[PDB]
Amino acid sequence: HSQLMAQLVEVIEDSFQMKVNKESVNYLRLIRHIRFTIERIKKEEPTKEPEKLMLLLKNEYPLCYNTAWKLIKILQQTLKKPVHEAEAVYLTLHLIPI
Amino acid sequence: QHSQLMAQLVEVIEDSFQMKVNKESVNYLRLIRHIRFTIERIKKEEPTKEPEKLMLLLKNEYPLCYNTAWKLIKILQQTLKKPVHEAEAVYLTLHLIPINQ
């Protein structure tokens, strides 16, 4: 899907008004994710909703991810209630901009 | 309140990122609002509809990456001629975020 991948890349460059770093880990990862999503779509297999997101966030933003978990550690120690993993995902996403 | 708890969460954030949060800024306010909601869901022991919640979060907080992901998803659907699920837009947004920055 050479022309398809090129077109997807162009939409991203136009939209974000940047040129991709084709050297970078983030880019290499994106193209691999797109190639794999193509296959899942062809096969009509479901997306993994949950624990997949966690690994992704850990790899893309280790510092925000681990920061989320230190927050959650303090919350558990204080409030004593269990913490559903989905909470580390939301916090990681709220921390990235800071 | 959870005032001291909040204060302690913010120090930890400041120290992790090697920064000072301007406590008279919109991003100090945004941050603590999201954090109080986390506390409330933990204390009250409430689960979230995770695909549903992420889509809402991303739309509000990463609107450029989210909207661009939806455009890509529609291209894939039209080219491959297959259904695409909502979860794709989410996982694709998360790969774009580090790209836009």
UniProtKB/Swiss-Prot annotation, chain A:
Annotated PRD domain ranges read 1-94
Regions crossing the membrane? none
Briefly state the modifications made to the protein after translation.
Phosphorylated by HPr (PtsH) and EII-Glc (PtsG). HPr phosphorylates the PRD 2 domain which has a slight stimulatory effect on GlcT activity, while EII-Glc phosphorylates the PRD 1 domain which inactivates GlcT. The phosphorylation is dependent on the presence or absence of glucose which acts as an inducer of the ptsGHI operon expression. In the presence of glucose the phosphoryl group is transferred from phosphorylated HPr to the sugar via EII-Glc. Under these conditions GlcT is not phosphorylated and binds to the RAT sequence, thus allowing transcription of the ptsGHI operon.
Look up the signal peptide feature and give its range: none
Q: Where on the tree of life does the source sit, at the highest rank?
A: Bacteria
| Modified residue annotations for Phosphohistidine | 33
Functionally, this protein is described as follows:
Mediates the positive regulation of the glucose PTS operon (ptsGHI) by functioning as an antiterminator factor of transcription via its interaction with the RNA-antiterminator (RAT) sequence located upstream of the ptsG gene. The RNA-binding domain of GlcT directly binds to the RNA antiterminator (RAT) sequence and prevents transcriptional termination. GlcT binding requires two identical and nearly symmetrical triple base pairings in the RAT sequence.
Which family, according to UniProt? Belongs to the transcriptional antiterminator BglG family. GlcT subfamily.
Assembly with partners or alone: Homodimer. The monomeric form probably also exists but it would be inactive in RNA binding and antitermination.
Domain remark from Swiss-Prot or TrEMBL: Composed of 3 domains: an N-terminal RNA-binding domain that prevents transcriptional termination, and two PTS regulation domains, PRD 1 and PRD 2. PRD 1 is the target of negative control exerted by EII-Glc and PRD 2 is the target of HPr.
What protein does this entry describe?
PtsGHI operon antiterminator
Which species does this protein come from? Bacillus subtilis (strain 168)
What gene name is listed for this protein? glcT
